[PDB]
Paper text:
The p47 immunity-related GTPase (IRG) [name] plays a pioneering role in host defense against Toxoplasma gondii infection. [name] is recruited to the parasitophorous vacuole membrane (PVM) formed by T. gondii and disrupts it. The overall architectures of [name] are similar to previously solved Irga6 or Irgb10 structures. They consist of an N-terminal helical domain (N-domain; amino acids 1–55; αA-αC) (purple in Fig 1A), a GTPase domain (G-domain; amino acids 56–239; H1-H5, αd, S1-S6) (green in Fig 1A), and a C-terminal helical domain (C-domain; amino acids 255–415; αF-αL) (pink in Fig 1A). The membrane-binding interface of [name] assumes a unique conformation, composed of N- and C-terminal helical regions forming a phospholipid binding site.
The NF structure did not have any nucleotide or ion in the pocket (NF [name]). The G4 and following helices αd and H4 change their conformation largely from the NF state. The G-domain of NF [name] exhibits a similar conformation to the NF form of Irga6, although the helix H4 and surrounding structures assume different conformations. This difference can be explained by the increased flexibility of G4 because of the absence of nucleotide, which is further stabilized by a neighboring molecule in the crystal packing environment. The helix H4 was stabilized by the interactions with the neighboring molecule. From the NF state to the GTP-bound state observed here, the conformational change of switch I pushes the αE toward the helical domains, generating rotational changes in the N- and C-domains.
Author numbering: -1 to 81, 94 to 175, 190 to 277, 287 to 338, 343 to 359, 367 to 399, 404 to 415
Write the structure that this text describes.
């Protein structure tokens, strides 16, 4: 009953990295206590509210520094795009409407003190600041960082690196910031980021830190904002989506019918992982084959083809083992999310992997 529901709620969220949890440790213990006290309406009301804040979370990121190719590329990276100003300029995310990346002019190109620069750029609107440079950070930049901390807000230093398509990283950091820990006195990190490959240098560490520092309810929309170009960014999306459908199942209490209603949800999920038709049709042409003949080696198109009801029956018993059960819609969504994430990971090395499926199976499904 309620006690087993509560203990199954607790065990589920222990399987996820700290920085990817879409609800706080406080809200977890809260929902547990209410369920244990059998205040079931109160618990559902809390879960509903949590889901409300996750789905409507705005994300406003201020990117401040000198103009140039590296800065524009990083702003596009935060919009999920792979391509003498004195005003800030908004750049809305093309796929998430609640997300806006702001281009702020470098403080050195204005006549503003740190405090007046921040009020001119309406600092209270943002979730955090990225202070970005292509060369070396100046005393200017360190005093702006100091002024942001004194507002009670977060900043991160990003140095962009021109690339073509270890020792380089250590040398660039000695060049770009050997005077930062003088002006600031706590030691701030610098994140080196490649202008071509988000897998390189410090960008994986940056996504992890930004997630860790954000409020729990904003982690979902941030994890979705980045393009599915590395195993790390795919898995942050996978784990965040899996938590969300579990919360939906917790608040809620003919497989072909259920599948047909999830059809729009399944297409949303495909777009998150880069498996929309257009993305797949493009990979198929680079491989010189029918897109229909391409998808034969992906697991997600034939996932719901031993009869399906028996496979699902056995799937549900594995997911239940470390009993609490949920609606069939929860298990189908969870299964589809693991299958699509695995297919997107395999396509990161598409052509070398054809040498019947190129992806790993979703756990507990085909065994």
């Amino acid at each position: 009953g309620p006690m087993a529901w509560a203990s199954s709620f607790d065990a589920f969220f222990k399987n996820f990295k700290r920085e990817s949890k879409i609800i706080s440790e406080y809200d977890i213990t809260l929902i547990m206590t209410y369920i244990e006290e059998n205040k079931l309406q109160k618990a559902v009301s809390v879960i509903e509210k949590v889901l409300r804040d996750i789905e409507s979370a705005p994300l406003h990121i201020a990117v401040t520094g000198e103009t140039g190719a590296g800065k524009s590329t990083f702003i596009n990276t935060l919009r999920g795009v792979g391509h003498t100003t004195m005003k800030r300029t908004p750049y809305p995310h093309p796929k998430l409407p609640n997300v806006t990346i702001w281009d702020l002019p470098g403080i050195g190109t204005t006549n503003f003190t740190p405090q007046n620069y921040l009020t001119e750029m309406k600092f209270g609107e943002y979730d955090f600041f990225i202070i970005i440079s292509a060369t070396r950070f100046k005393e200017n930049d360190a005093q702006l960082a100091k002024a942001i901390a004194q507002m009670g807000m977060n900043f991160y230093f990003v140095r962009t690196k021109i690339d073509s398509d270890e020792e380089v990283l250590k040398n660039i950091k000695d060049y770009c910031s050997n005077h930062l820990q003088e002006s600031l006195d706590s030691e701030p990190p610098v994140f080196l980021v490649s202008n071509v490959d988000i897998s390189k240098y410090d960008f994986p560490k940056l996504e992890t830190k930004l997630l860790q520092d954000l409020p729990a309810h904003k982690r979902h929309v941030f994890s979705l904002s980045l393009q599915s170009l590395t195993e790390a960014t795919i898995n942050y999306k996978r784990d965040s989506l899996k938590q969300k459908v579990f919360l939906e199942a917790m608040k809620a209490g003919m497989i072909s019918d259920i599948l047909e209603n999830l059809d729009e949800t399944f297409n949303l999920y495909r777009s998150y992982f880069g498996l929309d038709d257009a993305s797949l049709e493009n990979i198929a042409q680079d491989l010189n084959m029918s897109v229909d003949d391409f998808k034969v080696h992906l697991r997600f198109p034939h996932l719901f083809a031993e009869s399906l009801e028996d496979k699902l029956f056995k799937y549900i018993k594995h997911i239940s083992s470390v009993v609490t059960y949920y609606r069939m819609a929860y298990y189908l969504q969870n299964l589809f999310l693991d299958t699509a994430a695995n297919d997107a990971i395999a396509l990161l090395n598409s052509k070398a992997l054809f040498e019947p499926y190129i992806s790993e199976p979703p756990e507990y499904w085909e065994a």
